[PDB]
Every structure is written in C-alpha cells, then in structure tokens.
Short mmCIF file of C-alpha atoms and ligand atoms in Angstrom, two decimals:
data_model
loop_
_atom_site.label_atom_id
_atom_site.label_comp_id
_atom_site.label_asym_id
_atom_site.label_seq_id
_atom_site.Cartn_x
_atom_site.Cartn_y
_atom_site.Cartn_z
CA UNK A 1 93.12 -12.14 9.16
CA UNK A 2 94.48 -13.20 5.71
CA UNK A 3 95.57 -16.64 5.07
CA UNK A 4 98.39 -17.51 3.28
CA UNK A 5 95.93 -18.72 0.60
CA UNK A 6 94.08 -15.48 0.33
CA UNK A 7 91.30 -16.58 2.18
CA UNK A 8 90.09 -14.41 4.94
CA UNK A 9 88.72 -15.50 8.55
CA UNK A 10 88.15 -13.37 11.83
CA UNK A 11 91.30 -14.96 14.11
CA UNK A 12 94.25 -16.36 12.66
CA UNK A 13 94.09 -19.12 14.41
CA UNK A 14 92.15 -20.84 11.91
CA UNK A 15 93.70 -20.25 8.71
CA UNK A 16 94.51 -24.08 9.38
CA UNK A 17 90.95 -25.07 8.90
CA UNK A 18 90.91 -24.46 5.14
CA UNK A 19 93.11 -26.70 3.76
CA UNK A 20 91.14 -29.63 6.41
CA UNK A 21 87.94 -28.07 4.35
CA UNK A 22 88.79 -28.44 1.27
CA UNK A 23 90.07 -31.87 1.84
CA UNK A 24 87.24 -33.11 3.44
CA UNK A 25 84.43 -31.83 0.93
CA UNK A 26 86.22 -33.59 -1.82
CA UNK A 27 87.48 -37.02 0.08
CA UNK A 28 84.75 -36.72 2.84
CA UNK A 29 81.71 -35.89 1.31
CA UNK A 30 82.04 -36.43 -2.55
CA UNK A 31 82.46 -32.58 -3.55
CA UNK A 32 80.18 -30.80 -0.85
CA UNK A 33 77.49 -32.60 -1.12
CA UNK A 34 74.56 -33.58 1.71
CA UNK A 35 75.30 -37.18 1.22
CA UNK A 36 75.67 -40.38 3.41
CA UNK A 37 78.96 -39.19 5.03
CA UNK A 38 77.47 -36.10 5.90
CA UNK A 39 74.80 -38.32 7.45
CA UNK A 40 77.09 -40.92 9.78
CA UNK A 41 79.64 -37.57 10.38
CA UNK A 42 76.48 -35.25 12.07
CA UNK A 43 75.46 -38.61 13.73
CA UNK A 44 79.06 -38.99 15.20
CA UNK A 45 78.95 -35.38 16.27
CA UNK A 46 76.42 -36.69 18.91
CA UNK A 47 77.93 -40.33 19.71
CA UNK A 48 80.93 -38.19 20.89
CA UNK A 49 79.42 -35.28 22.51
CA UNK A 50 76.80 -36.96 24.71
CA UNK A 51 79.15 -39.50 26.25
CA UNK A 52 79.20 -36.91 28.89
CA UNK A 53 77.79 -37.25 32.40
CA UNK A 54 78.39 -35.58 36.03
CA UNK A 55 77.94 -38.65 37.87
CA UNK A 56 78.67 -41.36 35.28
CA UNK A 57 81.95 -39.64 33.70
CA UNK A 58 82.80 -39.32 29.54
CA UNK A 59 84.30 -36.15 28.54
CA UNK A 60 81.43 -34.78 25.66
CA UNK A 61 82.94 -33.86 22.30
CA UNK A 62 86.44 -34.97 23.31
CA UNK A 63 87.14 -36.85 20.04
CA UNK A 64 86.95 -40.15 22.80
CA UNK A 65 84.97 -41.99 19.97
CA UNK A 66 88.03 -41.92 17.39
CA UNK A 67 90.60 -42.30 20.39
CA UNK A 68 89.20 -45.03 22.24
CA UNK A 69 87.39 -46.56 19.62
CA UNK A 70 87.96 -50.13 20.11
CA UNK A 71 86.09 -49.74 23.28
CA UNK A 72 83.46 -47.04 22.39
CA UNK A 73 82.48 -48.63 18.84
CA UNK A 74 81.59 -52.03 20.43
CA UNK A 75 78.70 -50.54 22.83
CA UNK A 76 75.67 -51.77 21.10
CA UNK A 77 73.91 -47.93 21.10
CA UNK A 78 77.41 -47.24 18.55
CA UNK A 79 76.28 -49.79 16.37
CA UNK A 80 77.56 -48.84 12.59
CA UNK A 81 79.51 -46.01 13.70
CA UNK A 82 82.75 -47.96 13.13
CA UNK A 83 82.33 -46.89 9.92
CA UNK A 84 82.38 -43.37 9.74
CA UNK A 85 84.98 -43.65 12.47
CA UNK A 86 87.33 -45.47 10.32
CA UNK A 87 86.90 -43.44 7.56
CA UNK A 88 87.31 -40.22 10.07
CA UNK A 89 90.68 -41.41 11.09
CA UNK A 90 93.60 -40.90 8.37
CA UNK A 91 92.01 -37.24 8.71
CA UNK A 92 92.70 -36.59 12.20
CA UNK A 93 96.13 -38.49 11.32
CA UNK A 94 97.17 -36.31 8.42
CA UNK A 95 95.78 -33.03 9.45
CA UNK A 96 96.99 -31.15 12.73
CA UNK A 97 93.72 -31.11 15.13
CA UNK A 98 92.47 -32.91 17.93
CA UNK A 99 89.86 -35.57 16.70
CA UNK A 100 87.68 -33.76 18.69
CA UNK A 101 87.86 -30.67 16.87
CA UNK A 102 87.92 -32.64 13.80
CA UNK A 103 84.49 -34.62 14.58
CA UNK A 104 82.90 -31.31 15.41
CA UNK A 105 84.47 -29.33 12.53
CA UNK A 106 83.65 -32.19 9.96
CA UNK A 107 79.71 -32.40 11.52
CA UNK A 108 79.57 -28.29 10.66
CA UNK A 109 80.87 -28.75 7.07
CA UNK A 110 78.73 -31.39 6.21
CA UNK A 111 75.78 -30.01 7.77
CA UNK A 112 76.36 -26.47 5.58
CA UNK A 113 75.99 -28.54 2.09
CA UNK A 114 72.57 -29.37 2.93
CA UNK A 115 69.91 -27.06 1.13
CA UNK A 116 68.04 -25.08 4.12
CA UNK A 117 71.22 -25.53 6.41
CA UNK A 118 72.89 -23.44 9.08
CA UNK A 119 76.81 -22.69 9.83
CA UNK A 120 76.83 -24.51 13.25
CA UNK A 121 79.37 -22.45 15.43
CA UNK A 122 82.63 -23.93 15.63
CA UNK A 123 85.16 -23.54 17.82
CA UNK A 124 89.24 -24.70 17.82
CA UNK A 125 91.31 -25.72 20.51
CA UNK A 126 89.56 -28.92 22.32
CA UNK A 127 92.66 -30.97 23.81
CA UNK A 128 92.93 -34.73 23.17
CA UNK A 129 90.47 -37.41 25.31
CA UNK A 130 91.46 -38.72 28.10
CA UNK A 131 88.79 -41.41 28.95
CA UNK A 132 86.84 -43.46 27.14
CA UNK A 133 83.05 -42.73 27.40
CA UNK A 134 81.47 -45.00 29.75
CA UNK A 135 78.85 -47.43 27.91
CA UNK A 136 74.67 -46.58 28.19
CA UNK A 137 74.80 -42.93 27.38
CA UNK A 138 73.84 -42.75 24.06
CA UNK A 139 69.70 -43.06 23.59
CA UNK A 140 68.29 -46.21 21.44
CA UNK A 141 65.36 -46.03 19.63
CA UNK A 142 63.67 -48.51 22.02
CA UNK A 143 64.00 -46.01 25.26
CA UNK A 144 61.22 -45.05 26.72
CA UNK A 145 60.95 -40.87 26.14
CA UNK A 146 61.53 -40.73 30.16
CA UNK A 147 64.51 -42.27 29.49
CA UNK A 148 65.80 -40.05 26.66
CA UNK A 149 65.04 -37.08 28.38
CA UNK A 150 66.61 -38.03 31.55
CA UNK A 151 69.31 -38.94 29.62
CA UNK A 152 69.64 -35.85 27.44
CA UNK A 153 68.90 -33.85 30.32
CA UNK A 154 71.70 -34.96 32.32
CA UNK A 155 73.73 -33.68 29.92
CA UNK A 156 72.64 -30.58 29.84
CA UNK A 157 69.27 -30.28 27.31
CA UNK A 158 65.92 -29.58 28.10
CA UNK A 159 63.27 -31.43 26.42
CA UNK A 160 62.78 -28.55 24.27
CA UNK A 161 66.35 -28.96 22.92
CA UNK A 162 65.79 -33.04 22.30
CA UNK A 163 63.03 -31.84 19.66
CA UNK A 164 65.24 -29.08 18.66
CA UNK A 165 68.39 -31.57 18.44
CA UNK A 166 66.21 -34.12 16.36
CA UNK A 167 66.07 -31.78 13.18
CA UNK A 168 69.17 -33.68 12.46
CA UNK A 169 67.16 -37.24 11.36
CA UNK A 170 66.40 -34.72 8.24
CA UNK A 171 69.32 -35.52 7.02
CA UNK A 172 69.40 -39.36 8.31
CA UNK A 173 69.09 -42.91 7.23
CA UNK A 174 68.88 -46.13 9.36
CA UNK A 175 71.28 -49.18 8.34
CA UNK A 176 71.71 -51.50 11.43
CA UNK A 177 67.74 -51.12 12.77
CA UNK A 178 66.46 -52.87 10.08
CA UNK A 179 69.60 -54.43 8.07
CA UNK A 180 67.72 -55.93 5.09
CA UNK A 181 66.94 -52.70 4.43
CA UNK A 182 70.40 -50.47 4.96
CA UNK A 183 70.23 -46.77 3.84
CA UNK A 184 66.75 -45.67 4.27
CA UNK A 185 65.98 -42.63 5.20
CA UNK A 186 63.84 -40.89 8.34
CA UNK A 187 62.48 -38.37 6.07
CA UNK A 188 61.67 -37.79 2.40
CA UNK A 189 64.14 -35.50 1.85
CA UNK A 190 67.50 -36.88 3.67
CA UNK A 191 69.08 -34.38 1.40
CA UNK A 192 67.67 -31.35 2.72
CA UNK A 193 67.77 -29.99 5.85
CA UNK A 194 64.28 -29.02 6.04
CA UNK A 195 60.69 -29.80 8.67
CA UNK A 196 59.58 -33.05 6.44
CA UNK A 197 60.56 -35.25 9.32
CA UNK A 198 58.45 -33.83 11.92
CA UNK A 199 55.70 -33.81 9.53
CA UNK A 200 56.18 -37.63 8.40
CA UNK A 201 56.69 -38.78 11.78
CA UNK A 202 52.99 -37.30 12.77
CA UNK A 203 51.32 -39.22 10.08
CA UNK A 204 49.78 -42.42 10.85
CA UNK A 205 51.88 -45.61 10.49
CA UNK A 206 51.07 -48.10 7.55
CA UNK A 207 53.52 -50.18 6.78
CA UNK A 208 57.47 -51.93 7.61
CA UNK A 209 59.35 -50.96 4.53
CA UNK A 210 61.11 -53.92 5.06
CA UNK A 211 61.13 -56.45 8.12
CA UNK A 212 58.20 -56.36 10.63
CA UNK A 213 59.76 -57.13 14.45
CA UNK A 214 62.29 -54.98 14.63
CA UNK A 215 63.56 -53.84 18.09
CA UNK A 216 63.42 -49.70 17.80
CA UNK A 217 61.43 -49.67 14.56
CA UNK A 218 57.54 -48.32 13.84
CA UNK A 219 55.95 -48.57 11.40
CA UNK A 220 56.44 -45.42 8.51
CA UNK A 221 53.93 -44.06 6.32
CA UNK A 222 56.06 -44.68 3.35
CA UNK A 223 57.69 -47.44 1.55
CA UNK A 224 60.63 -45.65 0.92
CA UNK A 225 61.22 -44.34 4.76
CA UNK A 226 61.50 -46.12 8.18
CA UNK A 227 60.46 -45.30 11.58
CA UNK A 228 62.32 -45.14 14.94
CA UNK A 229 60.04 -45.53 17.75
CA UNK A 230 62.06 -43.92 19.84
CA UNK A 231 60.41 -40.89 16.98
CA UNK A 232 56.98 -42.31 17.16
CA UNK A 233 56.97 -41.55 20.67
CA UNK A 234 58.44 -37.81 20.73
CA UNK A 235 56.12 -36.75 18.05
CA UNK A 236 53.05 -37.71 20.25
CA UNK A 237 54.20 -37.95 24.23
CA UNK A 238 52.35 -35.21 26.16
CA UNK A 239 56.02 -33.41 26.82
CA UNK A 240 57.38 -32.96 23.49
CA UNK A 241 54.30 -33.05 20.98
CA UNK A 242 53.57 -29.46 21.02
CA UNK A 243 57.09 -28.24 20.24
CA UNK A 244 57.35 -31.15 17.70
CA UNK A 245 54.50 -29.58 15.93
CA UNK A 246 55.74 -26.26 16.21
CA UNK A 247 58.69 -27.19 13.80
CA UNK A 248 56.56 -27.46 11.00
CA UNK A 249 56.77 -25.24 8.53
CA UNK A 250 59.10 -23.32 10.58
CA UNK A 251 62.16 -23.31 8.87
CA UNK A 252 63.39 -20.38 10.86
CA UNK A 253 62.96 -21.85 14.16
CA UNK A 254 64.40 -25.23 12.71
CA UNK A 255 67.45 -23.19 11.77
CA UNK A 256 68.02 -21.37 14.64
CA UNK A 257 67.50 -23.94 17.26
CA UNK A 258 69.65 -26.46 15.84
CA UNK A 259 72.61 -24.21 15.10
CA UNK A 260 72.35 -22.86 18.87
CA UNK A 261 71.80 -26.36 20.00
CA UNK A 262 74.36 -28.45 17.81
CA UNK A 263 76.94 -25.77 19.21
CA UNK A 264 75.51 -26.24 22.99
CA UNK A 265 76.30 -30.02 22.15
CA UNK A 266 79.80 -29.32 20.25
CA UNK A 267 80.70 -28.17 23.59
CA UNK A 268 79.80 -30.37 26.18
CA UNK A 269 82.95 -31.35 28.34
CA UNK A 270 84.64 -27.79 26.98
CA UNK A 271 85.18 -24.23 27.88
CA UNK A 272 84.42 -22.08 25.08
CA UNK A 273 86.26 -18.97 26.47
CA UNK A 274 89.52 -21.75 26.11
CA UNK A 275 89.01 -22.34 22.56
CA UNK A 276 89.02 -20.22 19.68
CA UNK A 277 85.85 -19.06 17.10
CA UNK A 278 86.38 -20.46 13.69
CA UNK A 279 83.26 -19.95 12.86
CA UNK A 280 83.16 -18.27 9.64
CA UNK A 281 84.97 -20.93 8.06
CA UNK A 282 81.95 -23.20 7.69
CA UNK A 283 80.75 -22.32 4.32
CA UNK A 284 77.27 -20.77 3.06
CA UNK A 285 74.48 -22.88 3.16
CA UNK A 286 72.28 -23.58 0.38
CA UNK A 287 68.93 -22.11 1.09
CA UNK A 288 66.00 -24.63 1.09
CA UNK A 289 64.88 -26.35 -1.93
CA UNK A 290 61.18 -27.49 -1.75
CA UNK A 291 58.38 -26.07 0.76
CA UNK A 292 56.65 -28.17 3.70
CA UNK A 293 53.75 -30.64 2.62
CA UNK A 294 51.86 -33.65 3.00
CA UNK A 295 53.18 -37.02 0.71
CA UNK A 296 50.81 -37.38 -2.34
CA UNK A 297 47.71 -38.61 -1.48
CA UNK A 298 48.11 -37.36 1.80
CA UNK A 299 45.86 -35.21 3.79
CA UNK A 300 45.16 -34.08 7.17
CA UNK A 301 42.98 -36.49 8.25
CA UNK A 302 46.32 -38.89 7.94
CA UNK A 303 47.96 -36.55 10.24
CA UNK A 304 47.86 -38.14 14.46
CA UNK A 305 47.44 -34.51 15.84
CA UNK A 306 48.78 -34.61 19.60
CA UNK A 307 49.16 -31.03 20.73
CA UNK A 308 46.12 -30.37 22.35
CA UNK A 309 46.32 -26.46 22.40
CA UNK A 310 47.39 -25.75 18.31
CA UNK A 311 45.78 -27.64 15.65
CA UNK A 312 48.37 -29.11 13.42
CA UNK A 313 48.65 -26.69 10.91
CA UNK A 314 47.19 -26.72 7.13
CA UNK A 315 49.54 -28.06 4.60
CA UNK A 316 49.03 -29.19 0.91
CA UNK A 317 49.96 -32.71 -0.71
CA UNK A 318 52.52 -33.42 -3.59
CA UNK A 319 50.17 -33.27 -6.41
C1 LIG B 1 67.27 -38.32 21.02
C2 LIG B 1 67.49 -39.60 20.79
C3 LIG B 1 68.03 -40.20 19.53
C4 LIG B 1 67.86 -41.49 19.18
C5 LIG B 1 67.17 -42.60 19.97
C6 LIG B 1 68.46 -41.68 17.89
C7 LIG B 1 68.51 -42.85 17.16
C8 LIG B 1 69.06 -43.04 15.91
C9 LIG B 1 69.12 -44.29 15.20
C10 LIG B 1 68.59 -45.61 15.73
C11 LIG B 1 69.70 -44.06 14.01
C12 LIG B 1 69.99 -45.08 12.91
C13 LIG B 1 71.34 -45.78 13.12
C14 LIG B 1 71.47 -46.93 12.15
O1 LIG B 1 70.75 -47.94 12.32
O2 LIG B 1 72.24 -46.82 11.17
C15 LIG B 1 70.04 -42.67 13.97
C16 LIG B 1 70.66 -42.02 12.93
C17 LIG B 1 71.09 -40.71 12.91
N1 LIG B 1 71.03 -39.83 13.99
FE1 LIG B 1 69.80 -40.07 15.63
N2 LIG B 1 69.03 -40.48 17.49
C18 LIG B 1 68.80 -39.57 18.49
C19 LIG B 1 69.32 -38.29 18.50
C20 LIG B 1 70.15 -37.73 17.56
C21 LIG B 1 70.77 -36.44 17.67
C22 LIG B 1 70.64 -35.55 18.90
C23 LIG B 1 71.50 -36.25 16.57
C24 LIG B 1 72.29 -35.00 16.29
C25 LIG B 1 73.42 -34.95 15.67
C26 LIG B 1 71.32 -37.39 15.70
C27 LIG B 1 71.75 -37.54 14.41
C28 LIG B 1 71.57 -38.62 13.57
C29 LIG B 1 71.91 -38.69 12.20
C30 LIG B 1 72.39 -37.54 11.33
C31 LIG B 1 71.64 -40.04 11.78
C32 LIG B 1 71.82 -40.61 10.40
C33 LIG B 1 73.01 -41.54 10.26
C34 LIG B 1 73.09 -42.15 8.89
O3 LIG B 1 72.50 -41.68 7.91
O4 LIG B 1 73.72 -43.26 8.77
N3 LIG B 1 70.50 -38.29 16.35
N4 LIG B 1 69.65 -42.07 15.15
CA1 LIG B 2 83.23 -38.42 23.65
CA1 LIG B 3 64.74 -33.68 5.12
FE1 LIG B 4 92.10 -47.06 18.17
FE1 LIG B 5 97.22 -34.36 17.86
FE1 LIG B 6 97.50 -35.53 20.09
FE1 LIG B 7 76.57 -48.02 7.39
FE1 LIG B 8 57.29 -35.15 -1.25
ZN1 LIG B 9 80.45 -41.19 -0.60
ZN1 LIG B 10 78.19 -45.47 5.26
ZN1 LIG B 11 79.97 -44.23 5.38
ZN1 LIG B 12 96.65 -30.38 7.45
ZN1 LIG B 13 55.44 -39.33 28.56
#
C-alpha cells in the first residue's frame, strides 16, 4: 500500500502509524535517538505487558498502565514509571490508537534507534483496557531468581526467554534504586543495543557507585554503572548462567531472541490473528557500533565464570 504521504507499508491499515512516528522521534526521543525516553518507553513496554496472569488477572499489553494509572503507577515495583507515563499520555490523546498499541509501537521505535538494534514486530488493533493490573506482578530486583521465573513463567516465558528478555538493561539506567545517584546505567554502553551487559554483570563486584545498603542493588565493577541483584543473581544461578554466557559476543542471537521475545511479550493478553502487522513501519536499525570486550584493565581472571560446561569465552580489554 501507498500512503497518502508517499510512504509505502504492506497493509493499509497502518498508513496511520507514520505521522505517530515521526512525531514521536522528534517530541519522544529527541530526533531518533537511543536516549533516556527510549530507555523508560522499552521499560514501560514490560510494566504493561507482564501485568498479565491466568489466575491473578491483568490483561498484558493492554495500555492498563496509561489507563489506570493512578492505581498501577503507585505499586511500589512501578516506581518512576509515572514519568514516562505522563509524558506517554498527550500522545495516546492526540493520536488515534489504543495506548496499548501506542506503548508497544513507541517501545519498537525507540528500540530501532539504538546501534545493533532489531525492528521488534508490531502489530495494530489491541482494544482499550479494561482492568487495572493487579499489584505484585512486576519482578524487583530483590526477588529471589525462583521468584522471577515463576513469575515470568506464569506469563508465558521460559527461563531461557528471562535471559533473552534482559538484553533490554543494554539500553537501561537505574534512577529510584539508588536515588543519589539517578541515571546510571546497567551497562557501558546504554546507547547501544549490544552483549556489554551480560559481560559486565559476570565480572566481579568492586564497588557502590554511589550509596552502599541499597535494597535491589550489588555491587558493579564500575564507577560509572550500577548493579541490580536481581542481575547478579541471573548471571550466576545454576538455571540461567549458561544461556547468560551464551549472549556474549553473540550479537546475532541477542538480536534474534529479543525481537521474537519482545513481540511474544507485545502480545500477551492479545490475539495476533485479531490485529494487524505493521511491522515494516519500525525503521532500520543502526548496525552495532563497537565490538564485545572486557573494561580497561580488565581481564579474565575478573570474569566469575558460572557455566560449568563452556568456559567463558576469550575477549580483549579497552586498551
Ligand atoms: C526479569 C526481571 C527484571 C527486573 C527485576 C528488572 C528490574 C529493573 C530495575 C530495578 C530497573 C531500574 C528502575 C529504576 O530504578 O529507575 C530497570 C530498568 C529497566 N528495565 Fe528492567 N527488570 C527486569 C526485566 C526487564 C525486562 C523483561 C525488560 C524489557 C523491556 C526491562 C527493561 C528495562 C529497561 C529498558 C530499563 C531502563 C529504564 C530507564 O533507563 O529508566 N526490564 N529494570
Ligand atoms: Ca497492562
Ligand atoms: Ca549496551
Ligand atoms: Fe488516569
Ligand atoms: Fe481511543
Ligand atoms: Fe478509546
Ligand atoms: Fe526518572
Ligand atoms: Fe568500554
Ligand atoms: Zn529527552
Ligand atoms: Zn526520565
Ligand atoms: Zn523521562
Ligand atoms: Zn494522529
Ligand atoms: Zn537457583
């Protein structure tokens, strides 16, 4: 199909995306770039979505978080989200989509400005909520990982897909785990979707970049990044260490997983075959700027290996 713009896109349909696009690069994320709003809006993709359960209720990616957002914004695992909520808002107002569509189509944008990104699929159509999520269904960083994979998996992922989900904190900062230190990233490269985080979270802990007691935090290997425990924990429990590993210096796997994953999760509480595929709409990623490696200074003996059956692999420092 042809848009009335000139722009092309597979089913009509979604010739209303592009004028949403274009308005949210520029007023969104501050002329396409992989930035803090891309950040709290990919973070909101999965405070919506996983407010989902058979026997607890929540409808997934309803949009419930924008809708019902004096409830859902007060649970303490939303903490900060209010934010990016607020700011969400006179979108969903001006435009003519559901909020959920809109949190799941602004998630995919952002994502795509991010060097070594991936078009998440996205599909149009999801109605408007019609219940608030109940509260205790997003994971903290203090859960246990039992408790995040029970939690994960009773929405639908596998422990495999929590590791596979978690190439988000990438492209992630904390600002309410440690507040005296708002904005710091999980990774050295929160601009680039790329495997430093699940090579940083395997090094050995040295230091609270800021404040030394609090709950959910570890301690990081670098001033300039902070630790969830909830992290700590993945990257070495007996379940998810080796497929942790295995995302290092993997950029294709990275890639793949979380595009098939992030659209498993776009769709919890939907019907895919009831919606439509805008999918081409997301632009063109950047491909990925820099290469897996140890910080300068670094080496292997800093890494806490904790798959038994693969060595970690063999990567170079910063110089
Ligand atoms: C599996 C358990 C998870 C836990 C315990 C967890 C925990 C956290 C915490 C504590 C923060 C920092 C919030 C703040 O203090 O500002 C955060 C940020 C973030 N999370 Fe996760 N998360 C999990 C899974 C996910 C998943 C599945 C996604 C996928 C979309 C995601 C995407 C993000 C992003 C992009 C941010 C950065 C927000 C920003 O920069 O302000 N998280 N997460
Ligand atoms: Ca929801
Ligand atoms: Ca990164
Ligand atoms: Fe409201
Ligand atoms: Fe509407
Ligand atoms: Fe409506
Ligand atoms: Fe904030
Ligand atoms: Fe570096
Ligand atoms: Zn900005
Ligand atoms: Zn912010
Ligand atoms: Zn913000
Ligand atoms: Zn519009
Ligand atoms: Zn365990």
């Amino acid at each position: 199909a042809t848009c009335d713009d000139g722009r092309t896109t597979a089913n009509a349909a979604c010739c209303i995306l592009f004028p949403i696009l274009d308005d949210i690069q520029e007023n969104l994320f501050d002329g396409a770039q992989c930035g803090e709003e891309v950040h709290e809006s990919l973070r909101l993709t999965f405070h919506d979505a996983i407010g989902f359960s058979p026997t607890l209720g929540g409808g997934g990616a309803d949009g419930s978080i924008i809708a019902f957002d004096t409830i859902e914004t007060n649970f303490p695992a939303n903490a900060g989200i209010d934010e990016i909520v607020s700011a969400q808002k006179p979108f969903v107002a001006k435009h003519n989509i559901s909020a959920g569509d809109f949190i799941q189509f602004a998630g995919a944008v952002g994502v795509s400005n991010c060097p070594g990104g991936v078009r998440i699929p996205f599909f149009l159509g999801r109605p408007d909520a019609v219940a608030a999520s109940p509260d205790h269904l997003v994971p903290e960083p203090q859960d246990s990982v039992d408790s995040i994979l029970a939690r994960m998996g009773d929405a639908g992922f596998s422990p495999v897909e929590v590791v596979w989900l978690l190439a988000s904190h990438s492209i992630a900062a904390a600002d309410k785990v440690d507040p005296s230190i708002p904005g710091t990233p999980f990774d050295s490269t929160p601009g680039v979707f790329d495997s430093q985080f699940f090579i940083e979270t395997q090094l050995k802990g040295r230091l609270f970049p800021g404040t030394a007691d609090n709950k959910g935090e570890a301690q990081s290997p670098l001033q300039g990044e902070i630790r969830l425990q909830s992290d700590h924990l993945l990257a070495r429990d007996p379940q998810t260490a080796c497929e942790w590993q295995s995302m290092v210096n993997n950029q294709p796997k990275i890639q793949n997983r979380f595009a098939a994953t992030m659209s498993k999760m776009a769709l919890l509480g939907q019907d895919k075959t009831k919606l439509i595929d805008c999918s081409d709409v997301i632009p063109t990623p950047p491909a990925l700027v820099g290469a897996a490696h140890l910080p300068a200074g670094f080496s292997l003996s800093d890494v806490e290996q904790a798959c038994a059956a693969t060595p970690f692999p063999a990567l170079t420092a910063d110089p």
